[PDB]
Sequence to fold (402 residues):
Amino acid sequence: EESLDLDLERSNRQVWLVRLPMFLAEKWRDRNNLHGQELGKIRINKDGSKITLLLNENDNDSIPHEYDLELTKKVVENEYVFTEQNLKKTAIVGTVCHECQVMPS
Amino acid sequence: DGPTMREITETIAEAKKKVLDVTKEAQANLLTAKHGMTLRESFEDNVVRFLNEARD
Amino acid sequence: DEDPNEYNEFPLRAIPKEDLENMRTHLLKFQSKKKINPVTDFHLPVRLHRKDYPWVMEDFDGYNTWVGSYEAGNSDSYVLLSVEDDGSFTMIPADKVYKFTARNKYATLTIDEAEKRMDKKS
Amino acid sequence: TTFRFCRDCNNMLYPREDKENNRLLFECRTCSYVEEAGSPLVYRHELITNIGETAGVVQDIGSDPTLPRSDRECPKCHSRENVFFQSQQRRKDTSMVLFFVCLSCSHIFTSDQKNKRTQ
Ligand SMILES: [Zn+2]
Ligand SMILES: [Zn+2]
Fold:
């Protein structure tokens, strides 16, 4: 579009940044795109905020183990995500509202 | 001699305490350095001097 | 144990393989000290250009410029999680993380002259 | 001392006197920032230091086997369980005063029978 321009963060879209263990990501790659690559689900538990990640049964044969997430602060920093398409257009997609680390299990 | 060895052991024994006594005195900050010497330098001098007085 | 409680769990679409910018989702990070505010009438415009490659970010002239440099990697990696209107989450791997990386400015008509004065010092 | 930085630059602050209202400020030499001073003290030398004596007193201090123990009753919790060391300020002059760290209340007491401390 306008060349060399950046796109639209003004919309204030929020996204989460999550640190994942290398092994888990490796597993995720396995999921088929055709499937839509549903890796598993995220659980939000109350009685305090607890968030965990569990792999889909298809991913591994065993009992799915929950991976606890440690919520973290934004830190004194502003993190924004920008994307570059094949077209090489650049867009300012969203701001990182929350940070989290998925612990290995 | 058997008793000379008892007498020697008890010479070192008393010097060993005399040293602990100056150490306890130095740890309690009551030690008063000799003009032109560290509080520590002054202490080590005493320790070294007692221990030699003893060996002799 | 038994779950007397309720959990809200969302399906996670492990990263869709085919995305237009599947290839590039990047992180642009600014230090809080820089005090960059995206909601600025001034910062309405913004251009991002590769410097020939650090990225160069610039607003309209008269505004600060930032340089973006790439951070080192690790065993763990970051994914961007976005949520669809339907609760489902889609995750995308971060291609690269850049620390920006801007100007000041007040660096014109100086630098080279100051060093020279400093030399007039020794 | 304890000095501040410029919000906006993060660059350090240089003192400027406001000749008119007879007051001290802190200017930034990279931008147009100025802020009034908290204290009148700008520079402190300190030749006869005491900062270094009780350094590296991590709560894990008890986990050092190299450290010696004593049956001295604590001024706070009265516990006869404590590790001890000498002034960690690695100077020649330095006194052989001992610092005892409680294996319960974590309070630092000394053997100094000349003076009374709080560090
Ligand atoms: Zn400044
Ligand atoms: Zn105590």
Q: What stands out?
A: Chain D touches chain B at residues 92-98, 111-115 (CB under 8 Å). Residues D 6, 8-9, 11, 28, 30-31, 33 surround zinc ion (ligand 1) (CB under 6 Å). Residues 51 and 89 of chain D are 7 Å apart (CA to CA). The longest strand of chain D covers residues 13-18.
